[PDB]
């Protein structure tokens, strides 16, 4: 009754609905906002056309899916850095940090035998080293400014943080690791995810925008 595809679709118009808004209400951050979640549009479409469905071992894996992690998140971070004020040494830090998350999940996935869960781990380890920098020296930092650009900074924070860490544990009860949930399922979840992590995180800075 729905298959990958309509999923895929599904996560291409909420990321093309949140491009088209944030292009709107910016006619710096909404630059980032519009790069974010316009190349997860472009991810989905070719994801939904049937493009880049690499087969692995046993498994099905997609490729479009961390090509746009590794281009979006870190713009999410830089999007968190600018909202904390970080000078650009600790730009230089968190998203060396996060390239090497998103980079070994990637070979990670590509890879077919037990190689993988070591990949998965390293990940795992610059991951929380990732989350000490959001909680901590980017929360100090954050703390210089005004009391409502701090106010957004946690907020925004609080979702990326909790919403960040689910993912993990998605790819690894997924195809890609102990592949206990079904591709449809495992998708489904990262779609919803996606539209969160990109979309709602856009929608929570707009309207504080407007609260000034
Ligand atoms: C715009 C944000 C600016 C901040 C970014 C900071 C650094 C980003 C890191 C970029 C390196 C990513 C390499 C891309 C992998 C391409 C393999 C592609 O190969 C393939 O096609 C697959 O193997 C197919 O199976
Ligand atoms: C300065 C005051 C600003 C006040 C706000 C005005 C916003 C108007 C401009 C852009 C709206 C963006 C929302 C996208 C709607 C497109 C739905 C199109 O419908 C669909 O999604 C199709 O069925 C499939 O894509
Ligand atoms: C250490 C600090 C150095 C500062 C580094 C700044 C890095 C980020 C700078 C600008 C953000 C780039 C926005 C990309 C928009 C293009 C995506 C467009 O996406 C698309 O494909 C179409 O929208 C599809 O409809
Ligand atoms: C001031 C802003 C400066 C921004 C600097 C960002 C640069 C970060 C670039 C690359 C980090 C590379 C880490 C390599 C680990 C990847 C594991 C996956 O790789 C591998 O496992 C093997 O290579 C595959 O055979
Ligand atoms: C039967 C084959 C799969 C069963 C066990 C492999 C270890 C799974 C570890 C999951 C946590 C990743 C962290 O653990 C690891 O990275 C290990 O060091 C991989 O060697
Ligand atoms: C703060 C005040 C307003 C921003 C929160 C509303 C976000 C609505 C769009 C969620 C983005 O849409 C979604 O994530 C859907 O639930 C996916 O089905
Ligand atoms: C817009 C896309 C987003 C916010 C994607 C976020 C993805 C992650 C936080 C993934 C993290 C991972 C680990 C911590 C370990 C290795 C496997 C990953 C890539 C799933
Ligand atoms: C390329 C032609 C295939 C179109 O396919 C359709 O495209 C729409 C996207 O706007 C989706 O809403 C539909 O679910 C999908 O079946
Ligand atoms: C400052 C004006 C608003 C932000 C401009 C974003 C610049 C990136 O390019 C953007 O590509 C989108 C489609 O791919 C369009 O919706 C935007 O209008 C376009 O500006
Ligand atoms: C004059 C109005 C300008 C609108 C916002 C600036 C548009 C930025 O343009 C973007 O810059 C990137 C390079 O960093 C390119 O890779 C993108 O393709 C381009 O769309
Ligand atoms: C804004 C327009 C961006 C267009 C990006 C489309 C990227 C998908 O391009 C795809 O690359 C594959 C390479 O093997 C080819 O097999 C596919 O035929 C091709 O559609
Ligand atoms: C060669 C490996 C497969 C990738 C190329 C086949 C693409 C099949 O998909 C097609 O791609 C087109 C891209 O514009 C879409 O317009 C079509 O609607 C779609 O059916
Ligand atoms: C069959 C034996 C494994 C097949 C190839 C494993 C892929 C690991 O190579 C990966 O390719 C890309 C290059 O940047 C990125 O995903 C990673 O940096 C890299 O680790
Ligand atoms: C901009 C973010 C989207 C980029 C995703 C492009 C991924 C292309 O990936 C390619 O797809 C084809 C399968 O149909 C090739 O045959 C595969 O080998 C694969 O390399
Ligand atoms: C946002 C949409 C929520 C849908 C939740 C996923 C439920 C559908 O999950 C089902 O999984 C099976 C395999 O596991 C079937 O093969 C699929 O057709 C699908 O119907
Ligand atoms: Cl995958």
Do not use: C, H
Not at 9 to 24: D, E, R
Not at 74 to 98: C, H, K, M, Q, W
Not at 104 to 118: D, L, Q, S, W
Not at 138 to 157: D, F, H, W
């Amino acid at each position: 009754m729905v298959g990958l595809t309509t999923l895929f679709w599904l996560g291409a118009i909420g990321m093309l609905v949140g491009t088209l808004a944030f292009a709107w209400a910016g006619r710096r951050y909404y630059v980032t906002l519009v790069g974010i979640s316009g190349i997860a549009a472009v991810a989905y479409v070719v994801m939904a056309l049937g493009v880049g469905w690499v087969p692995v071992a046993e498994r099905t894996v997609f490729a479009p899916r961390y090509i746009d992690w590794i281009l979006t998140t870190p713009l999410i971070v830089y999007f968190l850095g600018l909202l904390a004020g970080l000078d650009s040494r600790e730009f230089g830090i968190v998203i060396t940090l996060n390239t090497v998350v998103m980079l070994a999940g990637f070979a990670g996935a590509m890879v077919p035998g037990i190689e993988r869960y070591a990949l998965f781990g390293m990940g795992a380890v610059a991951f929380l080293g990732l989350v000490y920098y959001l909680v901590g020296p980017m929360t100090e930092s954050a703390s210089q400014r005004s009391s409502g650009i701090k106010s957004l900074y946690v907020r925004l924070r609080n979702l990326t943080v909790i919403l960040w860490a689910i993912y993990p544990f998605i790819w690894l009860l997924g195809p890609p690791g102990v592949a206990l949930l079904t591709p449809t399922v495992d998708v489904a979840l990262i779609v919803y995810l996606d539209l969160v992590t990109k979309v709602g995180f856009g929608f929570i800075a707009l309207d504080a925008a407007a609260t000034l």
